Amino acid sequence: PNQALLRILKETEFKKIKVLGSGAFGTVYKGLWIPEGEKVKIPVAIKELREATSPKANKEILDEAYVMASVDNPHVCRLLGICLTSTVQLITQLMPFGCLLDYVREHKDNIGSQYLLNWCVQIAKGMNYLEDRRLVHRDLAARNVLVKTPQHVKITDFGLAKLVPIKWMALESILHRIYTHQSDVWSYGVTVWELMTFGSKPYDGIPASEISSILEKGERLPQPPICTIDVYMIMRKCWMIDADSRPKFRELIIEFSKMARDPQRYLVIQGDERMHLPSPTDSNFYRALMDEEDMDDVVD
Numbered sequence: 001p002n003q004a005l006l007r008i009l010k011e012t013e014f015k016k017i018k019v020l021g022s023g024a025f026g027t028v029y030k031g032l033w034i035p036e037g038e039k040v041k042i043p044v045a046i047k048e049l050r051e052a053t054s055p056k057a058n059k060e061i062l063d064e065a066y067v068m069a070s071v072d073n074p075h076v077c078r079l080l081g082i083c084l085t086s087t088v089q090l091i092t093q094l095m096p097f098g099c100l101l102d103y104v105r106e107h108k109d110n111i112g113s114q115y116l117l118n119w120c121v122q123i124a125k126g127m128n129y130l131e132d133r134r135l136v137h138r139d140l141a142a143r144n145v146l147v148k149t150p151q152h153v154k155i156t157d158f159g160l161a162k163l164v165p166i167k168w169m170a171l172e173s174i175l176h177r178i179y180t181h182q183s184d185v186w187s188y189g190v191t192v193w194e195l196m197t198f199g200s201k202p203y204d205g206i207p208a209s210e211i212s213s214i215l216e217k218g219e220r221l222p223q224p225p226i227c228t229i230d231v232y233m234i235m236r237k238c239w240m241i242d243a244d245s246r247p248k249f250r251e252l253i254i255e256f257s258k259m260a261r262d263p264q265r266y267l268v269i270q271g272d273e274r275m276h277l278p279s280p281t282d283s284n285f286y287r288a289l290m291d292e293e294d295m296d297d298v299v300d
């Protein structure tokens with residue numbers, strides 16, 4: 001655990017200025033950090049966890065925050081800072097574009113196959129990194145994947161489930177609260193389904209109490225109209241009862257990277273020719289402005 005990877009922040013160094021959105025664990029705010037002895041206002045993203053915390057949990061919360069601060073990958077948001085008072089405040093780099101769930105919703109039937117398949121590759125790369133570090137996310141979902149730029153996505157909220165998303169969870173996690181790299185593969189399947197349906201709610205109308213019975217019967221999420229049978233098959237392999245039969249993240253990186261080379265062969269999108277392949281000019285602008293970090297080349 002590198003203590004230098006986590007900055008302990010005092011309430012006097014930062015201020016929340018705008019609510020960006022709320023969820024089951026906390027509220028996301030646009031904040032401003034005013035460094036000690038400076039005059040600058042640096043935009044930051046703060047998430048405040050809504051459970052009443054005590055200083056007894058502090059050592060354990062801090063041990064978890066040290067792990068979240070250690071994750072170093074282009075496709076995973078690492079925790080930068082934390083503030084422990086009566087509430088828990090998690091500080092990271094502000095990402096204006098928000099989450100990939102809201103992004104695919106707001107760009108419904110306006111996203112090219114090239115983006116969708118590359119996002120699938122990037123999400124699998126970040127998950128594979130977490131698996132290599134022997135870490136289980138426990139809460140992979142399109143709301144937990146953030147947009148850095150339209151060409152660069154990063155998985156967020158790693159570690160805060162540990163310190164429930166029934167419809168994203170593998171059968172063994174619903175039944176026995178067992179969370180492994182292979183139950184993360186199941187959630188990856190559902191996350192992919194959320195992208196391919198432009199933010200559709202999985203099992204809409206179905207009460208969360210009925211999900212495990214529906215899964216036992218063999219019922220799964222319906223094939224999105226834009227996926228060929230090969231994209232659907234990879235998703236269905238993610239939702240198998242036997243965890244060991246599900247694909248590995250390393251195999252998912254390879255499969256979606258092969259698919260990204262022939263985008264029109266794997267996804268059927270209306271107006272996919274018109275859907276702008278990121279021009280070198282726009283990529284340079286996006287990168288110099290808000291994405292200077294190192295990142296693996298996007299599959300063309």
Ligand SMILES: *CCC(=O)N1Cc2nc(-c3cc(-c4cccc5ocnc45)c(F)cc3F)n(-c3ccncn3)c2C1
Pocket residue numbers: 020021028029045046047068077078079080090091092093094095096098099100101102142143144146156157158159160
């Ligand atoms: C569709 C939902 C949505 O728009 N967003 C959900 C969300 N959460 C965060 C976010 C996450 C974290 C966080 C928590 C745990 C580990 C982790 O490692 C680094 N950051 C992590 C925060 F600390 C703050 C936070 F706001 N955001 C968000 C929005 C903008 N910029 C950054 N994060 C969103 C968006």
